[PDB]
Amino acid sequence: MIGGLFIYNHKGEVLISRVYRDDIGRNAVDAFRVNVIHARQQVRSPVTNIARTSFFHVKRSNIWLAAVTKQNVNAAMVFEFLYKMCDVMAAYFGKISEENIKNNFVLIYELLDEILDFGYPQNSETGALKTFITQQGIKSQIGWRREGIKYRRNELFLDVLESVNLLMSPQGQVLSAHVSGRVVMKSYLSGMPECKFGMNDKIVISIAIDDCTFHQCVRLSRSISFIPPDGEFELMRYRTTKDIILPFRVIPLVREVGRTKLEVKVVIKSNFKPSLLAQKIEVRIPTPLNTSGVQVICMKGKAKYKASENAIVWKIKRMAGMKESQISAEIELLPTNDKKKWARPPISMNFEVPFAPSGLKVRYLKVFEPKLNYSDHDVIKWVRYIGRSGIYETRC
Amino acid sequence: GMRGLAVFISDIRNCKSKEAEIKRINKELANIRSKFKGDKALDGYSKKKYVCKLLFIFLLGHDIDFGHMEAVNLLSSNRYTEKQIGYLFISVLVNSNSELIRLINNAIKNDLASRNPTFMGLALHCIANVGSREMAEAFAGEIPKILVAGDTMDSVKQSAALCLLRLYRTSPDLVPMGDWTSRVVHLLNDQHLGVVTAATSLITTLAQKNPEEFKTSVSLAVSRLSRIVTSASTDLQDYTYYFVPAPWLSVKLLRLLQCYPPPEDPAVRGRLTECLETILNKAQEPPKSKKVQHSNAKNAVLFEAISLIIHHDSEPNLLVRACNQLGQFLQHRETNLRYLALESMCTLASSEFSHEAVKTHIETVINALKTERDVSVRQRAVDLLYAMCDRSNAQQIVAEMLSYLETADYSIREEIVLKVAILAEKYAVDYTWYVDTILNLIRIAGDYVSEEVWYRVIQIVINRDDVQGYAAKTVFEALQAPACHENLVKVGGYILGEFGNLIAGDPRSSPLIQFNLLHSKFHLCSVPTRALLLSTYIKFVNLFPEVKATIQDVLRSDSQLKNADVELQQRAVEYLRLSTVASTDILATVLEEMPPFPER
Amino acid sequence: SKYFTTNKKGEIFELKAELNNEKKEKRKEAVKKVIAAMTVGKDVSSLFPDVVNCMQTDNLELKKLVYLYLMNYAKSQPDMAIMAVNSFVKDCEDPNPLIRALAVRTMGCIRVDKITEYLCEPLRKCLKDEDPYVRKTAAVCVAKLHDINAQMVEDQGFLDSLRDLIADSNPMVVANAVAALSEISESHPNSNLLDLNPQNINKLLTALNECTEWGQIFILDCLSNYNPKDDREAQSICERVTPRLSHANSAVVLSAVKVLMKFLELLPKDSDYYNMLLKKLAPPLVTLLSGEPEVQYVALRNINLIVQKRPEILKQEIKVFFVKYNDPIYVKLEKLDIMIRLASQANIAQVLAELKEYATEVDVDFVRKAVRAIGRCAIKVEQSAERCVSTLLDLIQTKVNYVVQEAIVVIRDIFRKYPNKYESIIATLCENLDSLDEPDARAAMIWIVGEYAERIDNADELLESFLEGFHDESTQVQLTLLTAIVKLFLKKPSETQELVQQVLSLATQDSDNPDLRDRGYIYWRLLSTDPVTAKEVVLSEKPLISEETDLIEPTLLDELICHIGSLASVYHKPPNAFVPQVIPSQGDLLGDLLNLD
Amino acid sequence: MIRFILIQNRAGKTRLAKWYMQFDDDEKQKLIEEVHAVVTVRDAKHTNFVEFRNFKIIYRRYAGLYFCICVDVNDNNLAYLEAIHNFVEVLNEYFHNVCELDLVFNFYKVYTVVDEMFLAGEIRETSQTKVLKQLLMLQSLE
Numbered sequence A: 001m002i003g004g005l006f007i008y009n010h011k012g013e014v015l016i017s018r019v020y021r022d023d024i025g026r027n028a029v030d031a032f033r034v035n036v037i038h039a040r041q042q043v044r045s046p047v048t049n050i051a052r053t054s055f056f057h058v059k060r061s062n063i064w065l066a067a068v069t070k071q072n073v074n075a076a077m078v079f080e081f082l083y084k085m086c087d088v089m090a091a092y093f094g095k096i097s098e099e100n101i102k103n104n105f106v107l108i109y110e111l112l113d114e115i116l117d118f119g120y121p122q123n124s125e126t127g128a129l130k131t132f133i134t135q136q137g138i139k140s141q142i143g144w145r146r147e148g149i150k151y152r153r154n155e156l157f158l159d160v161l162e163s164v165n166l167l168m169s170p171q172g173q174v175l176s177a178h179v180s181g182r183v184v185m186k187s188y189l190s191g192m193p194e195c196k197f198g199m200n201d202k203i204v205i206s207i208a209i210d211d212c213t214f215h216q217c218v219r220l221s222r223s224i225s226f227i228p229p230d231g232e233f234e235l236m237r238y239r240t241t242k243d244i245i246l247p248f249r250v251i252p253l254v255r256e257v258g259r260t261k262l263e264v265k266v267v268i269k270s271n272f273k274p275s276l277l278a279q280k281i282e283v284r285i286p287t288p289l290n291t292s293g294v295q296v297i298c299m300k301g302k303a304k305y306k307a308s309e310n311a312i313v314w315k316i317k318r319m320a321g322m323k324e325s326q327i328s329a330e331i332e333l334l335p336t337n338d339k340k341k342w343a344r345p346p347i348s349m350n351f352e353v354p355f356a357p358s359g360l361k362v363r364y365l366k367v368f369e370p371k372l373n374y375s376d377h378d379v380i381k382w383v384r385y386i387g388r389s390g391i392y393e394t395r396c
Numbered sequence B: 001g002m003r004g005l006a007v008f009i010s011d012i013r014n015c016k017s018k019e020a021e022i023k024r025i026n027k028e029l030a031n032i033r034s035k036f037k038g039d040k041a042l043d044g045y046s047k048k049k050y051v052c053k054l055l056f057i058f059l060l061g062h063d064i065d066f067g068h069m070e071a072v073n074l075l076s077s078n079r080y081t082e083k084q085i086g087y088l089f090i091s092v093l094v095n096s097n098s099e100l101i102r103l104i105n106n107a108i109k110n111d112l113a114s115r116n117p118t119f120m121g122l123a124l125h126c127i128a129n130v131g132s133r134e135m136a137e138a139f140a141g142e143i144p145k146i147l148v149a150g151d152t153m154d155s156v157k158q159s160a161a162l163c164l165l166r167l168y169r170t171s172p173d174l175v176p177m178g179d180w181t182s183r184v185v186h187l188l189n190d191q192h193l194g195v196v197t198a199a200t201s202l203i204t205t206l207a208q209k210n211p212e213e214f215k216t217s218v219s220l221a222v223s224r225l226s227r228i229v230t231s232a233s234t235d236l237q238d239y240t241y242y243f244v245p246a247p248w249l250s251v252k253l254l255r256l257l258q259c260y261p262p263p264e265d266p267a268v269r270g271r272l273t274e275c276l277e278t279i280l281n282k283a284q285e286p287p288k289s290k291k292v293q294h295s296n297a298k299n300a301v302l303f304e305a306i307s308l309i310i311h312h313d314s315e316p317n318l319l320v321r322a323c324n325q326l327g328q329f330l331q332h333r334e335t336n337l338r339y340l341a342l343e344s345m346c347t348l349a350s351s352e353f354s355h356e357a358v359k360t361h362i363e364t365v366i367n368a369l370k371t372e373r374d375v376s377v378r379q380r381a382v383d384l385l386y387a388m389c390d391r392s393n394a395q396q397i398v399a400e401m402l403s404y405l406e407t408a409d410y411s412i413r414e415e416i417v418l419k420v421a422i423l424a425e426k427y428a429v430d431y432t433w434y435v436d437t438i439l440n441l442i443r444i445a446g447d448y449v450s451e452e453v454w455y456r457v458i459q460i461v462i463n464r465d466d467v468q469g470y471a472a473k474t475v476f477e478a479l480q481a482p483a484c485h486e487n488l489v490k491v492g493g494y495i496l497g498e499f500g501n502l503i504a505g506d507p508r509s510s511p512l513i514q515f516n517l518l519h520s521k522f523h524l525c526s527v528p529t530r531a532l533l534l535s536t537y538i539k540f541v542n543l544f545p546e547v548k549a550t551i552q553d554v555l556r557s558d559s560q561l562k563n564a565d566v567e568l569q570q571r572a573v574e575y576l577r578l579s580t581v582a583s584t585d586i587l588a589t590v591l592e593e594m595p596p597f598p599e600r
Numbered sequence C: 001s002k003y004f005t006t007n008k009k010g011e012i013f014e015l016k017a018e019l020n021n022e023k024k025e026k027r028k029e030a031v032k033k034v035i036a037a038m039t040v041g042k043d044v045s046s047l048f049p050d051v052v053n054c055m056q057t058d059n060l061e062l063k064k065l066v067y068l069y070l071m072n073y074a075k076s077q078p079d080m081a082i083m084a085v086n087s088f089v090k091d092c093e094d095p096n097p098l099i100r101a102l103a104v105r106t107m108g109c110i111r112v113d114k115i116t117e118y119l120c121e122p123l124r125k126c127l128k129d130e131d132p133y134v135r136k137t138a139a140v141c142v143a144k145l146h147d148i149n150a151q152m153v154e155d156q157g158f159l160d161s162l163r164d165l166i167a168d169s170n171p172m173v174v175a176n177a178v179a180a181l182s183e184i185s186e187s188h189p190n191s192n193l194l195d196l197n198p199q200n201i202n203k204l205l206t207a208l209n210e211c212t213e214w215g216q217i218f219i220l221d222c223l224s225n226y227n228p229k230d231d232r233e234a235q236s237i238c239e240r241v242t243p244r245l246s247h248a249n250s251a252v253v254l255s256a257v258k259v260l261m262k263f264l265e266l267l268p269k270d271s272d273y274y275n276m277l278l279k280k281l282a283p284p285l286v287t288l289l290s291g292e293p294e295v296q297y298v299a300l301r302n303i304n305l306i307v308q309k310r311p312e313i314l315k316q317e318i319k320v321f322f323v324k325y326n327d328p329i330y331v332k333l334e335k336l337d338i339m340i341r342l343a344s345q346a347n348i349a350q351v352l353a354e355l356k357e358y359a360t361e362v363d364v365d366f367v368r369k370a371v372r373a374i375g376r377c378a379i380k381v382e383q384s385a386e387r388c389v390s391t392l393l394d395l396i397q398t399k400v401n402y403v404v405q406e407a408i409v410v411i412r413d414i415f416r417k418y419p420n421k422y423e424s425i426i427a428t429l430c431e432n433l434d435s436l437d438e439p440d441a442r443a444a445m446i447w448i449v450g451e452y453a454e455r456i457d458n459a460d461e462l463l464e465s466f467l468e469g470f471h472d473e474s475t476q477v478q479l480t481l482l483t484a485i486v487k488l489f490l491k492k493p494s495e496t497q498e499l500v501q502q503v504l505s506l507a508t509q510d511s512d513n514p515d516l517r518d519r520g521y522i523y524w525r526l527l528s529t530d531p532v533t534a535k536e537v538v539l540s541e542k543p544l545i546s547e548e549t550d551l552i553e554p555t556l557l558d559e560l561i562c563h564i565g566s567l568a569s570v571y572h573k574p575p576n577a578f579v580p581q582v583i584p585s586q587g588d589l590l591g592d593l594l595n596l597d
Numbered sequence D: 001m002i003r004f005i006l007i008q009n010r011a012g013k014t015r016l017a018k019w020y021m022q023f024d025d026d027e028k029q030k031l032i033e034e035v036h037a038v039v040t041v042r043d044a045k046h047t048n049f050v051e052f053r054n055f056k057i058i059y060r061r062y063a064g065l066y067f068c069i070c071v072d073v074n075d076n077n078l079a080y081l082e083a084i085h086n087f088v089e090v091l092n093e094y095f096h097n098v099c100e101l102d103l104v105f106n107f108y109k110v111y112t113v114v115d116e117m118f119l120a121g122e123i124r125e126t127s128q129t130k131v132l133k134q135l136l137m138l139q140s141l142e
């Protein structure tokens, strides 16, 4: 039935676990960690199959509770149980948190072998359980808007604006990556509206640090609510480092032929939905300072060598997701400077994409105005997602 | 030492919750702040311990916003244990307060100006560890003097040298090349190898922008290296690590020499050659210990000597010897050694004196990849095959890449598929080889195949009559694995629509069998794929009149004519209509063999 | 080498001394600290004799702590935990129900050869115990042993023991026997455990009330497995099952529902009772949608199936499937599906008004599907078509880019279901030609202009503009442009020869797509050939499409309906799948896992 | 050069951190996490070298402890790998069969050992004999 109960922290480290059948290995854990906890482009569903193994999960605060099995289980049973377990837990140590899990390892094991024999949900009601449970839980505990604003037509605009940065090895290892973002809000709304905003759980509230800063108008307690300034303002600003969607992969095949020629082939792969177009794409492949000349052939877009720049610059107007293109170059060298071999600068890209590389998605924006006549259904709403390259570099 | 310290630390460990941990830390902070602020003076023991408790708390993650003044007092103590702790605190907790900085510089000055090497070393380390401009400005001028004075102790010279190096990296303008250069060079002749080691790190950095000024180091560096690598068991006992004499100083001397060209004095160049050959020889000797530490220490030196050889690019016998030794590492327990051998060999491939030697090891690389477990090693094996590939190599390398591909992981497929296409294009001997390669590529790993690339292969096959029948059979026999790649159905379906006739006569690849094979894929396919198969199927009504009725059957069906997609619904109708309303002469006019592509 | 291994000092040695202290509160604290350690990855294997000695105790909390530790080894290192089998045999005799159950569960979570020897006799004793907490455990452990190798005829003796256990004083005991059993029975042999079971049903259906939320859930699932033979056999089972809602909101209901659906269709369709049961099932399903989100999703995925099999049941209850702005996307989307399935002439008024709500919200993904949903509604109910198309026009004039481009793709499928009926609109659509960047939208405009060419005297300078950048166009867009421009020829052979040759020359001479190349030639071999005979193949009337696209093969559906509770009812797929093939491209495959549809 | 040195346990807990480059505390915190995520994921099959940001890391584990040196891309891997081991042997001698708790209770002393062997991002003294002689002279002082 249930083949394994795993509890992960916000890093996808397994804090505590119990495996109830020998099918479920180290393999199952990694699957969950990679394909759900660090899901990049996939839209999460409470249930997931990978490699003929099913994964159920609930998210509590910063903790992931997962259930795993390789059999045609009763799906509803699994989820119900998970809420009850969360019921039982929260009545020993309150908030279901990394901290509180950590402090209650011994009890948690205890609870598990009672609440669940061999993956079969057993009676798990709080009053009933005293008899079986020896342990106790370790517990732990305006001015920016003006009065009388009227519009014929109540409107709001949200812009999600992201810059994506990357350093990648020639073998495609992400050496480092971060996104810097902000949501800009432009609102012509009557009166003094309270707004309730909702997003996916991407943003957590020279070394990039995961941070989020909100406008002075923003309250917290899930979601966030504010009465917005009128017109245009920055609702929030943020930087993230995990689970970034790298829209392009650059695959370099640079080959030094003697000390006189240089063979350069570069392939770029777009890695997003097929129905989406990236634009203003440039690839900037550097050349050595002693370059006699260049023959470049490319069959998408156009390309040219620029000596003052010591670079080949390749331009592409549009590229759809899941496509591939190639440039190839042959470069001539005259090697006066003897020794001190060429230290290769990285290949860099520009591009713009109609999505947020961090994965941020806007789920809702509710407008409620207490005095005045209009309501949320009356408010026109546009969102836009602009994602841009920052320092997007690949070693070659 | 400090009972109160152990107690605080063990109290912290016994905490059952982060909440309790933070309670016990706040308690200590109150206590420390009282005592620091209080009427009673503290004995040094207490200053020492409490400063040291605050540092502990800093290292646990919490903020420390007082204490600095107390640790600055400890600097002026005459008790080592008190200064140590004071100096450790200001090194790990640096504040920008310009009174403290001035105060800390006095403390330094006294310790430097004492003649106590223990106190000198604490101050020297502080400078090196913090490295602030204010410190550079106070002492950068003095440090070389300490370093070259005939009376300063060895440890103080070691520590002065690395301090000077840190200062040179943070504050070059405070480190002019004065009169101390020759004597810093002279240190390479010190009896104390720790001193020699330290000086070498400094000179290497200094030699990067000041080569002419330390040009004399080459000769000294070479004669030191050769005495080290030939010295006996009972020589350098202090600096012998798992039977390998001065491995780290060796490495460092080989690294200094990469700042210069081959030695200009023929004598010196000769000694260096005997030197490098000795190192190469030792690689061929068996282990003196089976502990991995011995071979690693030995091989560190070997690898650094290989860099020097590559950097000089000037002795073909050493470069070849180098390849061959690396080639022998490619069969090795150590993933470490495999990794480094392939990496280093990639370099050697791009040199003229060495390219051909490397090609010699093709079989070994291919066998290593074939069995290799570590992904990063695999990757480097494939990079090597790419690097050495040429007109001779190409068919073997490509054969082997494709073979490997048939059982490869997913980890590595994408890059190999890419390399196969590119090499295929650069080095195709006959259009049939190219065709046989791509169709296979597509058969095994078609999911990573650029659309452009299966375009090419479909055009070649049109423009050359000789390979069409081969291409048809390959695709057919490929298509009849129970599992296959979608691009195979694209490529396969097109080739068969256009040339199925050349195998239709075989009774095991008949028109009926061809069709039903395709059709067992149809409804598992993408729409453009089905769009193609609807074209294939209509060419089949024409070429093979015998099966027109089963095909018309699939065209009249709901899933085709009431298809939600425009192309499919448009094709299935157009095609049924063709087969129904078109004269046979008409049908034949429309679905003739396609004309050959233009070559441009 | 062996550095940092020493066990003469440091944390392990400190814990070893604390494990031998003769104050038990200090030993208890040790074993906690040790367990805490395993969990963080420390090697604590050396402490094993010392931890095992702590079992020599009066104290319960202490003994139980040592067991938890041993359970940590049970799975991770099975050889480890075997070392203490002999203690488990004693502790299954010990005169405390709590300990008996503790020694048995643990014996059967170990897995090697040498488990059989020690476990069989003590399990024989445990299924025979005054305490139903011991027999509850023993039962589940019969499953555990079965999973351990060997057919075992004595195990076949336990297979009886389990059956005898289905008849028992305590619904906890019976419940777990059954769940052990149905799991056992599935794997591996077939037709096992078959009983007349009229007593069994009754024993289970009396059990199924006093039982805890878990006990029933297993019961029902097992029950549903059977095939009755009569009306009145089926009947009274159904009335017995009926009180179940909502014992335990989630799965108790859906397991009842499963049962009541298999047997339902075996009934006469009389109304007498058949009709009552069908009216009963509306309330409990609808109430599931007030649960937690995960469980909603499952219930919706299930309802979706149920609605195709018996559209009757929830025909009246479209209200509950209306979207709350704060539901998860997965619960939003599933609901949308069901709204279409229950959409009916009576309800379009509102549905259509709702979909307009959603299509104006800030969740792009959800917006896009909502316009599709409006189109799916117009296709579904012929009376809605005219109102839908109006709503879709409204939205297009709000100018929201991603709303325009979806709406228009929908509009084409609508023009296709209702030909020669919305022509007037076409100019209202061309007002927005500039603002289309997605490839689908473009093709929907293009195809629209290809049909209905003659309605537009300007159908020229439109299709001209789309040639300009004929590459950098989706090959879908090129194929549509090709057919639309050969549609323009056969329709208006005047200014067309310009276009027709230019477009046939690109497909035939430029584009490397061999499929496109083929199609260009094909048309070229009709058109610049014989004006007449091409009209019939191309302009021939194409039939009408309907929304049997969503619907599941009735054959399959029945299979899935039999699986109502389970994963299979979530994936909508036969078990043999997730428990002849074409492997899609990485382009295709990565693409697919983003299509919310 | 050596950028920084870490000694960490399986849990992610730092027991020594020594920095030879300017970093903010947030930054150091971040790096300490990142190093932990990289190294704890590799089994005994992997190399002891791995690229890390725009540097690379050489590491080995002893019992529950990871020793990690972050160095420049062009530094000699095996040399630093044995530097780690040489360091560990000095620790083992100085603390008489070192255990993890020796590094906790004597944290301040560990910095002395490190400064003797490494300084300003370079190897300073490699002689186990000399380093101990010095460390034991230090200890006897008041």
Ligand SMILES: O=P(O)(O)O[C@H]1[C@H](OP(=O)(O)O)[C@@H](OP(=O)(O)O)[C@H](OP(=O)(O)O)[C@@H](OP(=O)(O)O)[C@H]1OP(=O)(O)O
Pocket: B002, B003, B004, B005, B031, B049
């Ligand atoms: O000043 P107190 O609040 O009384 O605290 C005492 C004590 O001073 P007392 O002798 O007056 O109890 C210790 O001993 P002395 O240094 O004064 O001889 C001191 O130091 P040590 O245990 O390191 O020697 C110790 O530690 P700390 O102030 O760091 O907690 C601290 O003892 P308590 O922990 O029992 O307060």
Ligand SMILES: [Cl-]
Pocket: B239, B245, B246, B247, B248, B249, B250, D126
């Ligand atoms: Cl050395």
